[PDB]
Write an enzyme that holds these catalytic residues in place. Sequence first.
Site, mmCIF file in Angstrom:
data_model
loop_
_atom_site.group_PDB
_atom_site.id
_atom_site.type_symbol
_atom_site.label_atom_id
_atom_site.label_comp_id
_atom_site.label_asym_id
_atom_site.label_seq_id
_atom_site.Cartn_x
_atom_site.Cartn_y
_atom_site.Cartn_z
ATOM 1 C CG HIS A 193 48.681 31.695 7.337
ATOM 2 N ND1 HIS A 193 49.718 31.380 6.677
ATOM 3 C CD2 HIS A 193 48.587 32.910 6.716
ATOM 4 C CE1 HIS A 193 50.141 32.016 5.463
ATOM 5 N NE2 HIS A 193 49.356 33.098 5.556
ATOM 6 C CB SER B 171 40.957 28.360 3.026
ATOM 7 O OG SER B 171 39.696 28.078 2.970
ATOM 8 C CE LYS C 37 33.499 32.939 -3.685
ATOM 9 N NZ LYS C 37 32.186 32.609 -4.599
ATOM 10 C CG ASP C 38 36.326 37.766 0.481
ATOM 11 O OD1 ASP C 38 35.754 36.551 -0.081
ATOM 12 O OD2 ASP C 38 37.053 37.581 1.256
ATOM 13 C CD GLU D 253 17.379 41.111 20.585
ATOM 14 O OE1 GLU D 253 16.834 41.095 21.628
ATOM 15 O OE2 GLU D 253 17.482 41.954 19.482
HETATM 16 C C1 HEM Z 1 33.924 36.681 15.490
HETATM 17 C C2 HEM Z 1 33.946 35.526 15.035
HETATM 18 C C3 HEM Z 1 34.701 34.782 13.985
HETATM 19 C C4 HEM Z 1 35.329 35.423 12.949
HETATM 20 C C5 HEM Z 1 35.986 36.797 12.946
HETATM 21 C C6 HEM Z 1 35.995 34.377 12.155
HETATM 22 C C7 HEM Z 1 36.991 34.619 11.219
HETATM 23 C C8 HEM Z 1 37.328 33.621 10.281
HETATM 24 C C9 HEM Z 1 37.863 33.736 9.032
HETATM 25 C C10 HEM Z 1 38.205 34.948 8.146
HETATM 26 C C11 HEM Z 1 38.094 32.644 8.479
HETATM 27 C C12 HEM Z 1 38.780 32.308 7.012
HETATM 28 C C13 HEM Z 1 37.874 31.525 6.132
HETATM 29 C C14 HEM Z 1 36.520 31.701 5.910
HETATM 30 O O1 HEM Z 1 36.153 32.923 5.936
HETATM 31 O O2 HEM Z 1 35.631 30.727 5.703
HETATM 32 C C15 HEM Z 1 37.773 31.684 9.294
HETATM 33 C C16 HEM Z 1 37.869 30.176 9.075
HETATM 34 C C17 HEM Z 1 37.508 28.997 10.030
HETATM 35 N N1 HEM Z 1 36.621 29.547 11.324
HETATM 36 FE FE1 HEM Z 1 36.255 31.312 11.903
HETATM 37 N N2 HEM Z 1 35.565 33.103 12.679
HETATM 38 C C18 HEM Z 1 34.631 33.407 13.680
HETATM 39 C C19 HEM Z 1 34.099 32.380 14.282
HETATM 40 C C20 HEM Z 1 34.270 31.209 14.369
HETATM 41 C C21 HEM Z 1 33.365 30.124 14.876
HETATM 42 C C22 HEM Z 1 32.186 30.481 15.884
HETATM 43 C C23 HEM Z 1 34.013 28.683 14.555
HETATM 44 C C24 HEM Z 1 33.370 27.522 14.960
HETATM 45 C C25 HEM Z 1 32.498 27.409 15.856
HETATM 46 C C26 HEM Z 1 34.972 29.313 13.756
HETATM 47 C C27 HEM Z 1 35.609 27.957 12.971
HETATM 48 C C28 HEM Z 1 36.387 28.214 11.780
HETATM 49 C C29 HEM Z 1 36.949 27.479 11.069
HETATM 50 C C30 HEM Z 1 36.963 25.733 11.461
HETATM 51 C C31 HEM Z 1 37.504 27.825 10.016
HETATM 52 C C32 HEM Z 1 38.234 26.894 8.797
HETATM 53 C C33 HEM Z 1 37.587 27.224 7.616
HETATM 54 C C34 HEM Z 1 38.219 26.332 6.350
HETATM 55 O O3 HEM Z 1 39.002 25.304 7.111
HETATM 56 O O4 HEM Z 1 37.907 26.509 5.297
HETATM 57 N N3 HEM Z 1 35.164 30.645 13.414
HETATM 58 N N4 HEM Z 1 37.354 32.223 10.310
#
Ligand code: HEM
Lengths: 79, 378, 54, 54, 109, 55, 239, 54, 54, 68
Positions: free
Chosen positions: B200, B204, B226-227, B270
């Site tokens: 936040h 994004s 969209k989501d 798996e």
């Molecule tokens: C249970 C697993 C995860 C959840 C619930 C989650 C949730 C989210 C959500 C809701 C966003 C908002 C932007 C979008 O939807 O693209 C986001 C962004 C992001 N996530 Fe996660 N994420 C998860 C796992 C991960 C993992 C495994 C990584 C990296 C190895 C990661 C790295 C990032 C990054 C870098 C962003 C920034 C997106 C941007 O800058 O537009 N997340 N995450």
Amino acid sequence: GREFGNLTRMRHVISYSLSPFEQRAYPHVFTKGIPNVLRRIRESFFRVVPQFVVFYLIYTWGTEEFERSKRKNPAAYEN
Amino acid sequence: TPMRKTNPLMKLINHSFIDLPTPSNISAWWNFGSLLGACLILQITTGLFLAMHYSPDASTAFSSIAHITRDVNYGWIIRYLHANGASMFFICLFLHIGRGLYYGSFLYSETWNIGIILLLATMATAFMGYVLPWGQMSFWGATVITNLLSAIPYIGTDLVQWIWGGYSVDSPTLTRFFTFHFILPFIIAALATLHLLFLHETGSNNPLGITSHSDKITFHPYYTIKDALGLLLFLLSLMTLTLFSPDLLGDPDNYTLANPLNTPPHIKPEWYFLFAYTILRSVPNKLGGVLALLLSILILAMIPILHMSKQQSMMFRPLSQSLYWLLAADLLILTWIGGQPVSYPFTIIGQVASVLYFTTILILMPTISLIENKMLKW
Amino acid sequence: TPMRKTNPLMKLINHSFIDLPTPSNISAWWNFGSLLGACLILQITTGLFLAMHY
Amino acid sequence: SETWNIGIILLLATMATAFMGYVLPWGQMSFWGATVITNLLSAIPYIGTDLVQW
Amino acid sequence: AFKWRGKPLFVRHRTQKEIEQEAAVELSQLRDPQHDLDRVKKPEWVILIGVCTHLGCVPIANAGDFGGYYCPCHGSHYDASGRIRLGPAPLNLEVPTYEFTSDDMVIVG
Amino acid sequence: KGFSYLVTGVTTVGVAYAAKNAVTQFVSSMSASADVLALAKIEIKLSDIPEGKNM
Amino acid sequence: DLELHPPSYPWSHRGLLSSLDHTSIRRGFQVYKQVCASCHSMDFVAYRHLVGVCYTEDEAKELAAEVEVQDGPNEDGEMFMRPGKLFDYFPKPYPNSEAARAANNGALPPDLSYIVRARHGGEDYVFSLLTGYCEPPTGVSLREGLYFNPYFPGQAIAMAPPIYTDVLEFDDGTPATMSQIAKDVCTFLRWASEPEHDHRKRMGLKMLMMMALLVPLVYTIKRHKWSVLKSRKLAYRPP
Amino acid sequence: MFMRPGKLFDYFPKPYPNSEAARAANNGALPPDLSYIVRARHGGEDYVFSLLTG
Amino acid sequence: TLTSKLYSLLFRRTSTFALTIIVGVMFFERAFDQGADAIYDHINEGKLWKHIKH
Amino acid sequence: EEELVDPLTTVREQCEQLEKCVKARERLELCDERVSSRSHTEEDCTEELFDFLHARDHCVAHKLFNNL
Ligand code: HEM
Ligand code: HEC
Ligand code: HEM
Ligand code: HEM
Ligand code: FES
């Protein structure tokens, strides 16, 4: 800032928008839509497909070689 | 002032979800993150209803699951939704990580590290959950993965036996895993809240890789639908996976009761763990293989440091695009070899694939980035 | 500025716990919210360890 | 007022949690107290028994 | 295979040809050097723990490059004596404290 | 606006149908299982004479 | 040793919206209870689960009562025998695994409740296992307690050929050739492993119709809402 | 099933195979398990002694 | 005109919109379920036991 | 008198008349002759038997359930 009021500084950039009900949800489906999708696919095809083609060649060769090795050679018991 | 901006809970909801400035050019890939949360909710809901009948005992786990599938009303739906929802969770997680790599989202360093922790917690959760059915594959996979800890030089066997709860995987291990599997998803949810909190602060990112303060947009009337559409497509995929080919992403050997006196001929983890399985197999030394798996997972931490390009996104870096798709094909090779046994061609192709994975994520990517930087006269 | 005011997690922790304006004349009866939180944490940990064998 | 209502919801959740946890031992007290408290919902005029059996 | 402490226990009545094969194996080639007779109180009987020294898997008997044992998990190959010769396994198959009180019995405390 | 609202209404109708199906399936899953339901009314007691007291 | 891939037979229920042939399920159950029940147990199938698939409740009650089972302890704690009821599961041929191994030359007849889903290739394999019992090829020998079967992984199974022509008399009256018998067993095993087959197919058709209704509608809603942005025109007017 | 001399991990012998046998051998009364009898009765051991005494 | 009365009566107030949505949900649920069941029964006619039991 | 003809056998023979099943069978006969002729050999005709059975049962599965 964090609210829409203060995010950045822009000057004399004017934008025109139409109501969602006034306009069509699917304009230029055949005149522009399909050609646009085709041009996007053409642009992105040759930077993605070759890697997966190499992967498919490796997959096929590996499976065939495993099958070939699994098969028995008569020369092992020629005598 | 609207009520949404007065009540503190409404304040938080409006600021974080209703009126969150979001780039307009965001593509479909950014949907997956939201999907991930939905998947989590599914796994929290569906799995909960599975817990109401599952008995975490080595002598009754398989019988309990059979009772769930055959006697419990709509229980088969719930179990298949849970299993294929774990599969879809890993699909969406892999696509999320791939998107982050492609569009330079790793520059959100703290968000990237939180995401890495989320990935680790998800992997542990899924491993223990797959151990829960107490089938042949579940038991023997659990034995292998826990014996992985024996590689530790000094405290190698004491730690393994402390996790086992005995001298071998048995009812103590299953009950421990059941409890850990119950607790862990809520920790994942809290860690995801931290993920969103750290995201936040900066907001994004967009596919272009350029600051989009000029074209920010409220999330309520555009990305909500969209989501929702993304949710509809995800539910389409999940329901077709559970209603037409429920055992497509499963292993038949897991339908035999666990027998500690006979390992199945083709014991494999798996499908989401197959690349790690190949990276394990390829390295001869046991400690070497364990370290190779640890590096394979944690190289995402070093990835931001290796970023040596003037452009955040890769849509303007064709050579980097080719390298990235080569890496994706390499990951597919690793998964396929993980499916395959330990024989003449598969072993050597797996070793080559693991080496190529590490070199591409460590050497080829920075060198190509520097070459591209020189190409544009920076 | 101190780290408390820079990192968002540190922002939340400092604002809500480290540097939360509270009355000085608060008596011992206000100590039971923290006690309830400690009770919840203890119950969660102990119940987790119990369910490991239940 | 809002804090008070959230606290009331917290009290209800804790009461339910403790009730079910006390049912967990499956002793004489656990079984019979569970039966009594669950049958308490049979007082519901139209959907009483269906809810209790559910 | 028998069950001891929830773990497989292998007792293999290896034929004298297998004994010759095991004895002929060079100590230098072995990843963990050990003489074949050291791990077998009786040449024709080999008693081991049916657990792959790599990641706790049941080695398949009379299989692999050396026809002694084969790990179905990562490809570890063991000989009739149980010594590791090819694969990710770090050391040879464990030898319990078995004592042949009689020619038809084996027990220990 | 009527055509657009009709599209929205049909979409909401479909979503409501799916949601009710899912919720009812889960709630029924929380109900009595088949094995428990079977041994409910089939069993018939065969009682002897237990003296002259409550048994 | 190598392994033989079982052919993909054209089973009726393999269709996208196809259903199990309940006549075939009934015939396969007859073969199970009359031929394989002497060694193969079904611990997860009761004499219910049949009230709605192939038998009415009354005939299911009669079929259950046909076989006597051990009941709970009576006065003096002497566990007696009962005529048998619906909630009772299918009888176990042997009290424990050791008895099964002793009676089957050291081999354990596997539970057939999930056999179809526990074997690669599924019912196909099971069919190919029953049909194919060729004599050993030149150069292979096996113990008298083992029978050569090309589809069995080890190729030396300890199960004598279980089904042959006229081993059973079908109630329907169809010719009880070994192929028909094997196909019916395989259908019954598929039902036992996946009793929700028909319901799953019905819900799959229903979800296909619902999604075909919804996806275009939700996509139209998204396009309608985003048409403001996608048709937006912007101009730059420096002073 | 066979008879074994008996090891440390074995629990104390059960006098009757099931509750029905116990009731039959004790005039319809079930002799309670004594593993928790002190904690299961009000007064604890103090009660039990009195029961054996008076 | 059709819309001149439809939109003015049903789609004007959102409460009436929700009411007609719910009524349509009931009717659609019934009719769509009946049609899907008929399609599934016809596609695999004879196989199902509902036909056999006759 | 042996009225049941077991259409399995008829379809199996129908393959045994086809080109692939025939050539696999003749290769199997050659392998059998080889193994039988050699007094002391470890060569097992299992491989060619599997090669024959794969095509045979493939054709059978193509044209078996129609009779049933
Ligand atoms: C249970 C697993 C995860 C959840 C619930 C989650 C949730 C989210 C959500 C809701 C966003 C908002 C932007 C979008 O939807 O693209 C986001 C962004 C992001 N996530 Fe996660 N994420 C998860 C796992 C991960 C993992 C495994 C990584 C990296 C190895 C990661 C790295 C990032 C990054 C870098 C962003 C920034 C997106 C941007 O800058 O537009 N997340 N995450
Ligand atoms: C009178 C005994 C007996 C009869 C009749 C019999 N079986 Fe078996 N079955 C066995 C035994 C013993 C084995 C173990 C053979 C082995 O594993 O080598 C076995 C093996 C199997 C296997 C192999 C499981 C595996 O591990 O691959 C399947 C499947 C099977 N039987 C199903 C059937 C079906 C279907 C029928 C008849 C329609 C049948 N059996 C008839 C006792 C029997
Ligand atoms: C990210 C969250 C989760 C993941 C990735 C996950 C994953 C899995 C997987 C892969 C299985 C194996 C199912 C099978 O192979 O048939 C499983 C089983 C199970 N899980 Fe989940 N799960 C999650 C959340 C939960 C939650 C929140 C609970 C309980 C509150 C839960 C309870 C269970 C139970 C009881 C089983 C055994 C039933 C079965 O195996 O079908 N899970 N889980
Ligand atoms: C809100 C906090 C909690 C309260 C008030 C609570 C209360 C109780 C109570 C009163 C008992 C019965 C104790 C007894 O008579 O022996 C109990 C038992 C139990 N609780 Fe909790 N509990 C809480 C949290 C948890 C959590 C988070 C778990 C997680 C697994 C848990 C697991 C158990 C288990 C397994 C038992 C049965 C073992 C036992 O009886 O001690 N509890 N709980
Ligand atoms: S378990 Fe035998 S190779 Fe790792």
